[PDB]
Amino acid sequence: AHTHQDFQPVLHLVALNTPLSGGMRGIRGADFQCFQQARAVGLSGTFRAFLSSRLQDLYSIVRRADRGSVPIVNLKDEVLSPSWDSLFSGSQGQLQPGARIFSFDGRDVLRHPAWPQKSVWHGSDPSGRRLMESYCETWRTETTGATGQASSLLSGRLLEQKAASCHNSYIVLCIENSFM
Ligand SMILES: [Zn+2]
Ligand SMILES: [Zn+2]
């Protein structure tokens, strides 16, 4: 009714309610939006942006203990991946077949027109390591001349390796750092 509750260990992967360009005021600005939006919908967990930053590899964002066996689920608790570790194995973040990703407000980012381009910013290599030459100057710039690594959500993969212009407005995801 007013709080989302889970009775099994799971980590939520949820999308911000609006696409963002590479200029997010740094990782702190992206993390903050993740926190606000999670709280505004009753999620009790600690949400951080699914991105690599100047001083942070995407892989290490989730607590080590929860990396090997806690399923990654969407807003509606549907399983996207059996573990955090599975995404960064070299599979390029292959999601489960037919998997869906909802924004905190409950919209299906892939089917809803509010997200014009079906790509996700990540700025990481396939192992979740920061790409210092491709992460929009640590998410501080939306200039056409700079790039950040992105992935086409239509491929069913979160970690494809495409260097996109920072001016683009792509989907930004938020991952819970530890369960319940
Ligand atoms: Zn309630
Ligand atoms: Zn849940």
Side-chain angles (χ1 to χ4, degrees), residues 22 24 27 49-54 56-59 88 120-139 147-151 158-164 166 170-172:
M24 305 168 202
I27 195 69
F50 189 81
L51 306 164
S52 274
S53 50
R54 185 192 284 152
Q56 174 80 99
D57 288 330
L58 168 50
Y59 176 71
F88 306 90
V120 182
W121 283 125
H122 60 68
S124 316
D125 63 29
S127 297
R129 302 176 305 243
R130 93 202 76 177
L131 285 184
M132 295 186 104
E133 300 199 296
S134 197
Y135 66 4
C136 297
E137 308 307 287
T138 196
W139 313 106
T147 84
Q149 219 69 346
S151 183
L158 295 176
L159 304 158
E160 273 200 316
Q161 299 295 307
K162 313 301 209 300
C166 296
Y170 288 160
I171 308 161
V172 175

Side-chain angles (χ1 to χ4, degrees), residues 9-180:
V10 300
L11 294 180
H12 296 83
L13 186 53
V14 192
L16 285 177
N17 295 326
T18 65
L20 302 181
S21 63
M24 305 168 202
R25 278 182 125 184
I27 195 69
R28 281 167 188 69
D31 282 349
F32 183 77
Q33 287 200 48
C34 283
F35 187 100
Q36 294 189 295
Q37 297 178 29
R39 284 306 156 78
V41 299
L43 290 169
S44 53
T46 296
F47 287 78
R48 295 192 57 213
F50 189 81
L51 306 164
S52 274
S53 50
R54 185 192 284 152
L55 300 160
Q56 174 80 99
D57 288 330
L58 168 50
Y59 176 71
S60 66
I61 291 179
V62 170
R63 225 268 145 196
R64 188 182 56 210
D66 296 337
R67 300 188 186 150
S69 44
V70 184
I72 307 303
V73 303
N74 59 38
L75 189 68
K76 299 182 158 58
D77 305 310
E78 304 173 354
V79 168
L80 295 174
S81 187
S83 65
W84 174 251
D85 275 338
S86 297
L87 300 173
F88 306 90
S89 63
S91 57
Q92 289 177 281
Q94 184 69 63
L95 290 175
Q96 225 75 316
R100 298 187 291 168
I101 294 188
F102 304 96
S103 43
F104 290 101
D105 64 32
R107 287 173 296 155
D108 187 323
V109 304
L110 273 179
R111 296 186 174 75
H112 198 285
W115 292 268
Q117 291 157 79
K118 309 305 179 180
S119 293
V120 182
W121 283 125
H122 60 68
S124 316
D125 63 29
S127 297
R129 302 176 305 243
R130 93 202 76 177
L131 285 184
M132 295 186 104
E133 300 199 296
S134 197
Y135 66 4
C136 297
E137 308 307 287
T138 196
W139 313 106
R140 313 199 107 113
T141 197
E142 57 154 48
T143 199
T144 56
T147 84
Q149 219 69 346
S151 183
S152 184
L153 205 48
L154 278 158
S155 65
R157 294 189 178 74
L158 295 176
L159 304 158
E160 273 200 316
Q161 299 295 307
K162 313 301 209 300
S165 166
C166 296
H167 206 65
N168 288 306
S169 289
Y170 288 160
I171 308 161
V172 175
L173 304 173
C174 302
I175 181 73
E176 199 162 5
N177 98 283
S178 41
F179 81 84
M180 230 197 108

